[PDB]
Design a binder for these strands. Structure first.
Ligand SMILES: [Mg+2]
Ligand SMILES: [Mg+2]
Ligand SMILES: [Mg+2]
Ligand SMILES: [Mg+2]
Ligand SMILES: [Mg+2]
Ligand SMILES: [Mg+2]
Ligand SMILES: [Mg+2]
Ligand SMILES: [Mg+2]
Ligand SMILES: [Zn+2]
Lengths: 224, 127, 82, 211, 151, 114, 99, 100
RNA sequence: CCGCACAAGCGGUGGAGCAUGUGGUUUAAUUCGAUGCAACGCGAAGAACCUUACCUGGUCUUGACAUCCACGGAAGUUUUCAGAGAUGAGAAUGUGCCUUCGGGAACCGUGAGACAGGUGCUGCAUGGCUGUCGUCAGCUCGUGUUGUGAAAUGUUGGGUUAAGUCCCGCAACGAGCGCAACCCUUAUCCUUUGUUGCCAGCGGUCCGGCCGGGAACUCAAAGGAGACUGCCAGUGAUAAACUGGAGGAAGGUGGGGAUGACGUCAAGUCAUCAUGGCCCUUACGACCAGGGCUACACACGUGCUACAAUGGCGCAUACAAAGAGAAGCGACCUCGCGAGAGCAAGCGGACCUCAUAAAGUGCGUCGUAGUCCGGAUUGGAGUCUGCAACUCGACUCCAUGAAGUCGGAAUCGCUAGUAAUCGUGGAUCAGAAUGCCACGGUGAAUACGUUCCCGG
């Protein structure tokens, strides 16, 4: 992504000067209208160097977890993961999702068992109210673990939108040593992101830019 | 032609038959006012037809069994309405809105153990 | 009242004892456990002890008592008040 | 509090009777008491036959008994001579041409009876009850049960007061009627007295009655 | 009724008269469901009302109600530590019930040899602002104003 | 009225005036009336002596009034005097027909005591 | 000429298998059947105290439901009656064969 | 309960047994309308000479399984506790807890 | 925040009488146990004998019953004598059967003890079981993370729910016991099968679905199909959820049952049984008759019936349900005032019988009273059951005609087919139902609410 490509999307935009985090000073161009302005001169090379690492991970058969819980951007992140055959979290991130992997695996097994059972049959044997209730539970499990049913094991890389909002995920990752790739607004604490991208995390246009560029490079890394 | 019915109630059940052209009502080979020793029974059995306003347009051949006179008359009114329906099927709505396709299931309850009745609790002197 | 088709009821060995009274007359007041047998015109003007449950009380038989039973004269529940 | 007996409540729903014969009021009490006596005799003689189920039907005239156990050739002894004189004594106690049948269960770990009975045996072997039930529950569950629950009652360890214990393992739901829960009660007779033991195993839910 | 408020099952208009307050009426006077004997007692009395009061006995019903119908009631609770006789106003159905109870017991207490005679004697009384039903209405419309000190 | 039973019963329906007589119950009343053949609801007033005599006779057939009371008193006197169980109970004022001696026997027991 | 057979059971499934066997043996010989026509089956209630000492309130209610089937064949051949003679059934099934 | 009681009931039964015929004929005779009034008389006398325990009245329906006198299920003759146990393990065929 | 928690209702209790329990009191004995909830028409679903464990008397001691060892005898039957019987003494009758004839089985008796025997105590030695909190919604766990760790998180908060019911926020998430639901039962309809069930159409018919016939209908009883806030709007985090409507036999877990998470209470029971300890053993064992378990200065509970004209009485007449049955139900006939009796069909019963619903209604009568209310209580004479109705059964008839003329304080119970009434049956039972488990008839009133009581 080129600085012009970002700037038109508005990547330079930031939170209010009232709400910023201390470590973000190096990445901040300045202030206008009491608004923090992010410096694309740092943003572009760091994003490119992160894309290099993401391409490397995906080119060694890496499993990638796209992470974002914004109600606006949930579907964008889900489609972003689907466009590169990867795994995602687009709804509320459960505490200890990565650390309590065994519980998620039992939940994944239950979701697989319910969907297989409905295809196999025995719904007629169940009462119609029970069959409807089973369908509702299957739908609820699909809503919760639609993205990670096929992750199989712990992912090899994480992509995070608004790292401050998803702080539990990054704490888990660091506890596991799983690398964190994150779009970091001025209000976030950048310590947890090993490849940090400072940029707007709310705006739909810039978020979609991040996701599309990452997914293009991930498909490229897969293709070899 | 003929239009039957089966009106049910707490303990009665009544077959019903509509043969048009009249208003006479043979019931268990009886006449209504002669069938019952209660008048309100006859009133509540007239109720549905009185609402549809067709008295001497269809005579009735009906047969009620089991239960008490009120449950009887209720099953009667029910089967009446059922016949009215299967004879009109436009007035099914008319009696549903009239509230006569109810099929009342209000029935006695079993006498539960330790209860001097089906629901009444013994006079347990708490003090 | 038991019945009338069966007549009164009186014991075998009680009849033995009463016929001994017959042949003998006034004798040792006979005794029985059977307060249930019926009095008969033979046993008149005599007495008999019958078990109150622990001891046999002697009732001196008279006419008007005939036909009645013995247990109506041999008490078994005693009482002196409180 | 005082809970419902689990096998009684699931009978017919998922559980078959241990006797089937149709009879009438006249030939019923006699019938069932004869059946009691033959059952009890078998219990006492088969203390080692690992009897799990002793079902008895009285067909129209004949009667047949069927025993699900785990000492198959042993219940047979040799050429059924044991079970043959058994057929004689049951025909004589029942006054009926006897029809003995046996069909072992290869999963003694997977009933509620045989396991509790082993437990009581080891109880008179003076083993530690806790370790015993641990052994048993793990053997059974590992073998493939869906859940086991055990309980023993009475002055445990030769106590001076009746300490109870219950232990859970796996999953045993006792309010889902579609489920199958094998259950059994047994006893052990210590010098200190008697100690109750109760055993449940949930083994998945059945779909479509006994079928 | 700690979560929901239920009351009495919806009445049905009497087929014999078409009206409805008669139905709730006979039900208040009804015992164990002695329906026949109970409607015979009320119809026999409205008839002689239709004569001793001229026509409009069905309307003489209301001629009795409005004369006896209560306007005020008292309902005391322990909201702060003790009770107080508070006058208060209620929806028309409750006062329907109260006035009907008043004329149901007015008839029964008098006795007048027979139920039909006793009922007929009071219906007239209530219809003409005299007697005991309107009198017990005076009790409630009288003691209430004196204890209007507070609420 | 001035009938064989000295009592002058209500000038009302025959039987009501009849069972009024001690020793004459509904059975006695209707049976005596059967012989007269008069209506059940005939009052003593409006009825002449021409039938009062007859009914006086029909009740003279039975033993009634004081004579019956004397027979009932005797049927109990000697009963007590034989010292029979029920006789001793009659002497003690007790239910001689085998009822709960413990409670709610106040009928023959009489008043309530602490 | 009729042949009636009452069947008394405890579960209607078993009696249904039995009646199936009956009517099939009937049609083997081409018997002339009048159908199962289930009859009023009998229900026997029983409540007993479950508490050994001083507890009238505690009781448990059970019930026996003898399911009831009837078959009739108006033209029994020999090849009809031989079947019921050579009939094969369970134990809890109860038969009552008659003219 | 006490084995004495059990065996005693057995004896009462067997005794009521072998006098059944005589009891039948004597009941007949004493009940026989227009008996000799002496044949009937000495008949009832001889009847009061038979062992008492030949009557059925001396008997008491006793629990077969326990010997509990009370709570006798004349259908099964079992203690009120035992019939429930037969339902619990499924001994009585076809039986189950009712719910109506 | 909650529950008929109160409230608001509805009918009671507490007055009367009677039944029925308990404790007193008494007994020779009034057998034991149950003891606020959570004893008290208790265990008992049914004590004249039996039951009975209890009194009194009568007796027995390897014994009523169990096993073992001898000795003997077939086993049996039937009768006499005495006893009050238990029992003792007998007399007759049979003296067999399988036998490898040697024995053996069935059993019977005697001895011998090895033993039996216990409802002896100990539910604070226990098993098993049940009552209670409470079908209250809770109770917990795995893993995670949080802290070095006691621990915590979930289980919290905002909503919402019958509900730890649900949802969302969320270092929690996920499971388990629960809750729910799957069960049974009940409400609509469909398929199947239609006799002993049905009679719509038909003809016949003495008019009786009766008789041909009918398979429809009704039921029958197996299948089913159904109700999901599925619909629509109203809301409401757009969330759950909620308001209301429609549809609909049915609507918001349709109706009702079964189902009791934990635990709590040395809750109850060693007199169901089982069982540790002790415990007597010619007896704390056993066997028999009689008694008692039924007493009554009393007390206390629980019920029934009443105090009346919505009633009483007479006459007339309609409508049920659910059951039960062959040492059984038992019609029919006749008789008997009835209680009944005789006669005897039928039926192991969709078939016969019980079994002929009451309240209801129609008509007349009473005309308000200690009454034609009320009926206890005593009299007389039966009836029936069983050996046997004194102690103490049920029941008819005649006769009597207590109190009671609506019951202080206090208090109970009840949210719909409920209450409240009217009858029906069943279990137990020779017989002995106001009780209890059931069934239908009739069918109400009240909820402002949660401020109060009670409890959670
Ligand atoms: Mg014992
Ligand atoms: Mg008896
Ligand atoms: Mg004791
Ligand atoms: Mg539950
Ligand atoms: Mg709580
Ligand atoms: Mg005795
Ligand atoms: Mg007693
Ligand atoms: Mg009267
Ligand atoms: Zn941001």
């Amino acid at each position: 992504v080129s600085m012009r490509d970002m700037l038109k999307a508005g990547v330079h935009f930031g939170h209010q000067t009232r709400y910023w985090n201390p470590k973000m000073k190096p990445f901040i161009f300045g202030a206008r209208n009491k608004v923090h302005i992010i410096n694309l001169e740092k943003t572009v090379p760091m994003f490119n160097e992160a894309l290099a690492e993401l391409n490397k991970i995906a080119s060694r058969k890496g499993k990638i977890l796209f992470v974002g819980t914004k109600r606006a951007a949930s579907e964008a992140v889900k489609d972003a993961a689907l466009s590169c055959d990867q795994f995602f979290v687009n709804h509320r991130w459960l505490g200890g999702m990565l650390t309590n992997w065994k519980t998620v695996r039992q939940s994944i097994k239950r979701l697989k068992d319910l969907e297989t059972q409905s295809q196999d049959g025995t719904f007629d044997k169940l009462t119609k109210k029970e069959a409807l209730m089973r369908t509702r539970e299957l739908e609820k499990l699909e809503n919760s673990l639609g993205g990670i049913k096929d992750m199989g094991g712990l992912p090899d890389a994480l992509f995070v939108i608004d790292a401050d909002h998803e702080h539990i995920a990054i704490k888990e990752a660091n506890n596991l040593g799983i690398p964190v790739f994150a779009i970091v607004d001025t209000n976030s604490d950048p310590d947890g992101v090993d490849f940090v991208i400072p940029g707007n995390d709310d705006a739909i246009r810039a978020v979609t830019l991040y996701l599309g560029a990452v997914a293009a490079t991930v498909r490229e890394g897969r293709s070899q | 032609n003929q239009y039957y019915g089966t009106g049910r109630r707490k303990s009665s059940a009544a077959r019903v038959f509509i043969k048009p052209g009249n208003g006479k009502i043979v019931i268990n080979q009886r006449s209504l006012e002669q069938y019952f020793g209660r008048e309100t029974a006859r009133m509540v059995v007239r109720q549905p037809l009185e609402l549809v306003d067709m008295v001497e347009k269809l005579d009735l051949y009906i047969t009620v069994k089991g239960g008490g006179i009120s449950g009887q008359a209720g099953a009667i009114r029910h089967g009446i309405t059922r016949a009215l329906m299967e004879y009109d099927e436009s007035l099914r709505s008319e009696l549903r809105k009239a509230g006569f396709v109810t099929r009342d299931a209000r029935q006695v309850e079993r006498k539960k153990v330790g209860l001097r009745k089906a629901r009444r609790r013994p006079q347990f002197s708490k003090r | 009242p038991r019945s009338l088709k069966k007549g009164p009821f009186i014991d075998l060995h009680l009849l033995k004892k009463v016929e001994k009274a017959v042949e003998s007359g006034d004798k040792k007041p006979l005794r029985t456990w059977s307060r249930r047998s019926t009095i008969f015109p033979n046993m008149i003007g005599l007495t008999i002890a019958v078990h109150n449950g622990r001891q046999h009380v002697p009732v001196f038989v008279t006419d008007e008592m005939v036909g009645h039973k013995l247990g109506e004269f041999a008490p078994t529940r005693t009482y002196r008040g409180h | 509090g005082q809970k419902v007996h689990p096998n009684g409540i699931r009978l017919g729903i998922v559980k078959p009777w241990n006797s089937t014969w149709f009879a009438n009021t006249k030939e019923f009490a006699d019938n069932l008491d004869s059946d009691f006596k033959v059952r009890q005799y078998l219990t006492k003689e088969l203390a080692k036959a690992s009897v799990s189920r002793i079902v008895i039907e009285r067909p129209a005239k004949s009667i047949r008994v069927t025993i699900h156990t785990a000492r198959p050739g042993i219940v047979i002894g040799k050429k059924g001579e044991d079970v043959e004189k058994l057929r004689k004594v049951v025909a004589d106690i029942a006054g009926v041409p006897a029809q003995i049948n046996i069909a072992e269960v290869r999963k003694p770990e997977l009933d509620a009876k045989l396991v509790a009975d082993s437990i009581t045996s080891q109880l008179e072997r003076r083993v530690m009850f806790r370790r015993a039930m641990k052994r048993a529950v793990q053997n059974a569950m590992r073998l493939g049960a869906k859940g086991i629950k055990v309980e023993v009652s009475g002055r445990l360890g030769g106590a001076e007061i009746a300490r109870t214990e219950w232990y859970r393992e796996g999953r045993v739901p006792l309010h889902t009627l579609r489920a199958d829960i094998d259950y059994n009660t047994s006893e052990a007779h210590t010098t200190y007295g008697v100690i109750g033991v109760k055993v449940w195993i949930f083994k998945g839910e059945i779909l479509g009655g006994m079928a | 009724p700690r979560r929901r408020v239920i009351g009495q099952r919806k009445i049905l208009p009497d087929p014999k008269f078409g009206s409805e307050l008669l139905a709730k009426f006979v039900n208040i006077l009804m015992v164990d469901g002695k329906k026949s004997t109970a409607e015979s007692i009320v119809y026999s009395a409205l008839e002689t009302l239709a004569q001793r009061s001229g026509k409009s006995e069905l309307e003489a019903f209301e001629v009795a109600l409005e004369n006896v119908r209560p306007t005020v009631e008292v309902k005391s609770r322990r909201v702060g530590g003790s009770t107080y006789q508070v006058p208060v106003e209620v929806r028309p159905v409750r006062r329907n019930a109260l006035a009907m109870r008043w004329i149901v017991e007015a008839a029964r207490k008098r006795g007048d040899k027979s139920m039909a005679l006793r009922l007929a004697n009071e219906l007239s009384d209530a219809a003409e602002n005299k007697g005991t039903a309107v009198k017990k209405r005076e009790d409630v419309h009288r003691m209430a104003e004196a204890n209007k000190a507070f609420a | 009225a001035r009938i064989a039973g000295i009592n002058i019963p209500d000038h009302k329906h025959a039987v009501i005036a009849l069972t009024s007589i001690y020793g004459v119950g509904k059975t006695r009343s209707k049976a005596i009336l059967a012989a007269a053949g008069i209506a059940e609801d005939v009052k003593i007033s409006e009825l002449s002596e021409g039938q009062i005599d007859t009914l006086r006779d029909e009740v003279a057939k039975f033993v009634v009034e004081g004579d019956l009371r004397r027979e009932i008193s005797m049927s109990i006197k000697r009963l007590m005097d034989l010292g029979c169980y029920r006789g001793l109970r009659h002497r003690r004022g007790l239910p001689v027909r085998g009822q709960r001696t413990k409670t709610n026997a106040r009928t023959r027991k009489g008043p309530r005591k602490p | 000429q009729r042949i009636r057979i009452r069947l008394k059971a405890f579960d209607h499934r078993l009696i249904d298998q039995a009646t199936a066997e009956i009517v099939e043996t009937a049609k083997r010989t081409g018997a002339q059947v009048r159908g199962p026509i289930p009859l009023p089956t009998r229900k026997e209630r029983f409540t007993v105290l479950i508490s050994p000492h001083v507890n009238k309130d505690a009781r448990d209610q059970y019930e026996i439901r003898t399911h009831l089937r009837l078959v009739d064949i108006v033209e029994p051949t020999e090849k009809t009656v031989d079947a019921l003679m050579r009939l094969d059934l369970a134990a809890g099934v109860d038969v009552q064969i008659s003219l | 309960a006490k084995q004495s009681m059990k065996a005693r009931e057995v004896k009462r039964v067997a005794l009521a047994d072998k006098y059944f015929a005589k009891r039948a004929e004597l009941k007949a005779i004493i009940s026989d309308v227009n008996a000799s009034d002496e044949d009937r008389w000495n008949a009832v006398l001889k009847l009061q000479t038979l062992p008492r325990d030949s009557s059925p009245s001396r008997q008491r329906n006793r629990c077969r399984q326990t010997g509990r006198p009370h709570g006798f299920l004349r259908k099964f003759g079992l203690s009120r506790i035992k019939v429930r146990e037969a339902a619990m393990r499924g001994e009585i065929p076809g039986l189950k807890k009712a719910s109506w």
